[PDB]
Amino acid sequence: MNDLERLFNPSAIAVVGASKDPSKIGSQILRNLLSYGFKGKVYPINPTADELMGLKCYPKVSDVPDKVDVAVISVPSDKVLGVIDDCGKAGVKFAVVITSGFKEVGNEELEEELVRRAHSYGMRVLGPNIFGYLYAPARLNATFGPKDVLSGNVAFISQSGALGIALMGYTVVENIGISSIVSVGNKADLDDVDLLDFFDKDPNTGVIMIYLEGIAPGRGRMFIDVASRVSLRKPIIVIKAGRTEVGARAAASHTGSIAGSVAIYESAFKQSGILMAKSVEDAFDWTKALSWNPIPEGERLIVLTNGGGAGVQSTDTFADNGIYLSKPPESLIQEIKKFVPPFASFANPIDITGMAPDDWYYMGTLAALKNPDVDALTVLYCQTAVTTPIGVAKGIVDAIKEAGNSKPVTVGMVGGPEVAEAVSFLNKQRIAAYPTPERASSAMSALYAYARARSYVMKSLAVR
Amino acid sequence: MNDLERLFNPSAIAVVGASKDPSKIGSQILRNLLSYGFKGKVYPINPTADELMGLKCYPKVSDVPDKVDVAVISVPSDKVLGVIDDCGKAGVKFAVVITSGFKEVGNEELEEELVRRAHSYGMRVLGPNIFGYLYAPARLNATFGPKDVLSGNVAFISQSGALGIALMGYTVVENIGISSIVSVGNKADLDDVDLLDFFDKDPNTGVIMIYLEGIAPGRGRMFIDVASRVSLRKPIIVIKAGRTEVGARAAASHTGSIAGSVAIYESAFKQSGILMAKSVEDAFDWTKALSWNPIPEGERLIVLTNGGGAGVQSTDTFADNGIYLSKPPESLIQEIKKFVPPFASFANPIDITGMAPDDWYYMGTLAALKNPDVDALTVLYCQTAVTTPIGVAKGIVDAIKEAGNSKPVTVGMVGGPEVAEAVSFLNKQRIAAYPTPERASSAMSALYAYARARSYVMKSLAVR
Amino acid sequence: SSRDLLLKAKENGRKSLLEHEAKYFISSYGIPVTNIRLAKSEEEAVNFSREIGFPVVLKIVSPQVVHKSDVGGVKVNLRSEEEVRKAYREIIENVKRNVPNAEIEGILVQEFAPPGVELIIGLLRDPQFGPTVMFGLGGVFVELFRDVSFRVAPLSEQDAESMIKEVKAYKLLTGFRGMEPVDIEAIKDALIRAGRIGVENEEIAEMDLNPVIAYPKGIKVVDARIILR
Amino acid sequence: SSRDLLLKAKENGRKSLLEHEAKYFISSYGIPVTNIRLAKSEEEAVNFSREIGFPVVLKIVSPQVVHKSDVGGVKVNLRSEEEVRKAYREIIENVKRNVPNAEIEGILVQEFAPPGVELIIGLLRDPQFGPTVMFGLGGVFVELFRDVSFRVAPLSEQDAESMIKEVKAYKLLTGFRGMEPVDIEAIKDALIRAGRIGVENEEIAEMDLNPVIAYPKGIKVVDARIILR
Ligand SMILES: Nc1ncnc2c1ncn2[C@@H]1O[C@H](COP(=O)(O)OP(=O)(O)O)[C@@H](O)[C@H]1O
Ligand SMILES: Nc1ncnc2c1ncn2[C@@H]1O[C@H](COP(=O)(O)OP(=O)(O)O)[C@@H](O)[C@H]1O
Ligand SMILES: Nc1ncnc2c1ncn2[C@@H]1O[C@H](COP(=O)(O)OP(=O)(O)O)[C@@H](O)[C@H]1O
Ligand SMILES: Nc1ncnc2c1ncn2[C@@H]1O[C@H](COP(=O)(O)OP(=O)(O)O)[C@@H](O)[C@H]1O
């Protein structure tokens, strides 16, 4: 009951609530399951249909001549308990209850009864009031959200249905590779702690992003124990809803709950090594950087820029994040002095001046990355007539390849439509690129923030 | 010498440094001037060429049989003083000195002499070390930056060259309509105060955005006097470089100057009614909202959302900016109850639930805007199965039309590529739209921040 | 066992510990407190005072008085046998006057703590995260400015040290005009032990160590409250 | 004219005003100060003390002493003629001890100001913005925590009021444990006047009013420095 292997990697899935009507949620889920390419058995459940989407249909899960691991349930709330009983009779391990209209609308007893019955059968519940879940390594899309996501190593968990399903779509626009989407909604049974336990052991998942409003009473201690251990190997980003006193009080009123302590949640996340995002943009920007880069191994961060102005924006932003730049290594300076003009600046940021052509970005980036006393690189570009954005981007790519190591890199590019395209190009190769110097710097800051968070946890685990 | 009318609206402009070589800066400027459609006289100045770009060329400005208002000077630094003398004898009112290599590289004496000589002829200097300037109402593009900008009411001033010319391009991507671009660079003579005086009186300019590193000693009091008065009618956004002790010290070291006081600059901006932006994105996000909306006339801000999560993100973000939501008017609540389900929420944000079709966004927005006890509206949308992003956008547009008033509105839309397109659609019609709820909320916050800043100034000007 | 103090109070339907009980209890966990003796007569009060060493302070001990000072039940800086007998009798009278129906357990005799930097060490139970330790500088800094840090228990040394450095009034511990630096290791240790108290004693709902006085060497809990559930 | 004080100091090659000169000067602008009888011998020091009324304070008046306490030059809360003569000789000896060659104008006699909430009002010249007024709470709050606000002069009432509410320690002015609210209008008024001093007097490079004591009604500048250029 605590192992989620067969939730994410089932042999057989039943879809309850699918019909010949393509507009019903159950039908949308079934369609996504086939479209996304699930290779195990799919069992549409419907009272009358003999067939749905070319698959043999059954009136009950218990009629299925197979062991069904997962039942995705999309029937009216007043029918859910019946379906649960049948799934229990069939030996189902996981009930993915899509259906709304439980505790979130005031019907608490029904939600508690739902979980009670599921437990009486050794069955776990996801939700209720969710849009489903997706697991890319199993080619499993059991949601009624977008039919596809970019494949990658990021697991995204959302307590919110509408924002969650929207953000599922937004990952594509932001080029974020996904290993899993999990809608947890009402969190009546399975919650964040259970999921973190699975993703800990999942070699497909390297980063976990969670939209979280709150956790259940008495669940916090366990949350810290599990999250801190995960944080030792995989970064966790939480978009915390109700992070302000006003917002927490707002969320408390809506649910009738007691307002969560802002200060104590903050401390719990710190003790967990978790990075708290104040916004969608920050969370997504950080996730990109953490997904596509290793942690820096020291403080020797270099900023490379063809403009003083962009460099100062960067310096200020790093400072806001407790990141301070040091003089570059003399070796790097001399290397760069070979092609750079006399009025260049080498204080860090290294200013190769506005006259810099495309190839100086190749040479500068390569020089920085190969240098044994450089730990990280943020590259800043301002579009001039004297350059091409795509040329600069391709120079950066070539430098990264040739350097042959994997030191963390972020890129900030400012300009017109040609910069928009170049930034897109870079992100499509899993090089973290942004349309401003501050965002590129905030992204690099996230890599250092995680390093420091991991260190906090390690220290706190030190043996006496 | 203090009136800039004939800088921005000249009858005749000379370009010194243009040649048959198109790669030359002077040649690029001449090219932009012609393509962008300047209607006055253009005089290419070149020692040997008799003709450039089909225009009669002269060896010296003083040879031109006309009164030249503006000379754009792009010759080597060691030749600039000579050109200045000739321009002076020719009665030139404004010397736009593109050329680099003055105080910014250590040659302070040269720069001071340049200004001294220009002044002895009653001629003013812009720069040096700049990329030029643009004034859309005069179809005047005297830069070597992008050839075009979107037409509008925003004047952008930049102390930084590379970042400035890059941001000039970025305005297009961000759909920001521009009235003017001015590169001020070294600020040896004409500075922010002089420009603010002109834009104060310019009916084409409604918003002023300034990238500012610092101002001259003894210039600050006048800066506050002028900026505060401008702020009474036109918002001023400053992207302050050197916002942090570290960054200010960085900028001080680079020039060898004494570092400007972070705290006192901040107070000066407050007394000026200026909004200080910590980043390009914030500055641009705010500029859009301020360009396309009137200031709210009261604090009855409504948030409309088809998702609780997005609404909480919005509430937290508004709170971070000192903006607190109140219960909606009873009339609006009843109005919306006509089509909304029983489990919708009316605490503000007004949550019309995730099942809301496109049409509810039209009805909700219209109801909100028409209500006499509503001062402003932020509309939040999460891409759901039940909706289309473009449909929601068009409903919002129609509602704004039918409401027929001018209450400030911002929009946040979250989703995939279809949301990206809908957001673009909204912005191209001058409705301030963003791909996250937090940015839409920060944009609306800027409108209130400006209202409060204006109020600060009005109070400080009260007669005893 | 010091647990007897919790069980006795529970047996008497009391929802909190008296001052001496609280101090005994936290002392048994290695948290430094003012030396104390429970006096039952003016005579025992003087003998205990001599043993503890002057100066001393006397406090009323009664389940009915929870704010000892606001009734004239607290007398500080007593430096003689005469001063002790003087404060003893006026406390008996000050309380008999303002709370006539009071159960007198005794008058607590305790050492007078010299001035230092005041601290607050707290323990509460958060619905989500359970026992949580609170830290802040004393006086206005917690009372008025709410400048406090939190860590969920149990506390590592890393938790204890970082939460101390976290508060805005931290510099009051590292030496300022008219004040030497204080013993931060002692503060860390007390915070950790406070956390342990919360983890282990499920019947302790709330604990407030306030004021705690920090010196260049060591610290001393001057007043301590412990609420039971 | 009060400007005569500035001109005299200039004439004597002095780059700052003596305490009594500084207080006289800011008083002429409507900023409240302590009584300042300048005594040349023990005898008038006592006559001045009686005339002024006890308790009083004695301070050294010397161009050479700029940090008066650190030379044993300040004796406060003197409530008897005996204590005045006691402190008089005690100060002279302390300064004769620590800076033997000192230019002595006299010993300044002033009333001992009763306790209140201490404030700092400053005036500096910023290269960009010229005369700038600074505000903060006294003691550790400016000295240690750097909790200060700034407004460029001249100050409107809006500037004065907002800059007061701006500092993190603002609530120390609006009533807390053991302290009533203080006269915010008096503080506003002094801030504006400080701004005016800076605008009008170009030879004043810096001014430091510290401490300024705020009461439920009115304020009183206790120490004042004015640096010239
Ligand atoms: N405005 C809100 N503030 C706080 N919690 C909310 C709010 N709206 C919904 N929730 C909670 O969010 C959880 C998920 O419900 P859901 O319907 O998916 O939210 P959403 O409106 O974001 O789609 C439920 O427990 C519900 O009570
Ligand atoms: N390291 C540095 N620190 C601060 N300012 C610098 C530095 N290097 C160059 N500058 C820049 O010098 C500029 C003066 O004009 P300019 O050279 O045209 O700008 P840019 O270097 O962005 O092209 C300032 O805007 C400032 O950004
Ligand atoms: N032993 C002591 N040494 C020094 N100061 C003490 C001592 N006991 C009490 N005080 C001071 O007297 C104040 C009032 O006494 P306290 O124990 O807090 O009683 P109560 O809070 O119940 O009125 C304390 O906050 C502390 O500042
Ligand atoms: N007239 C006075 N009334 C009350 N307290 C005073 C008076 N003069 C000085 N003090 C107190 O004594 C301290 C030392 O005196 P002060 O004038 O500040 O000398 P200094 O700052 O040069 O050491 C002041 O900070 C203040 O706390």
Ligand SMILES: [Mg+2]
């Ligand atoms: Mg440069």
Ligand SMILES: [Mg+2]
């Ligand atoms: Mg909802």
Ligand SMILES: [Mg+2]
């Ligand atoms: Mg007490």
Ligand SMILES: [Mg+2]
């Ligand atoms: Mg002093």
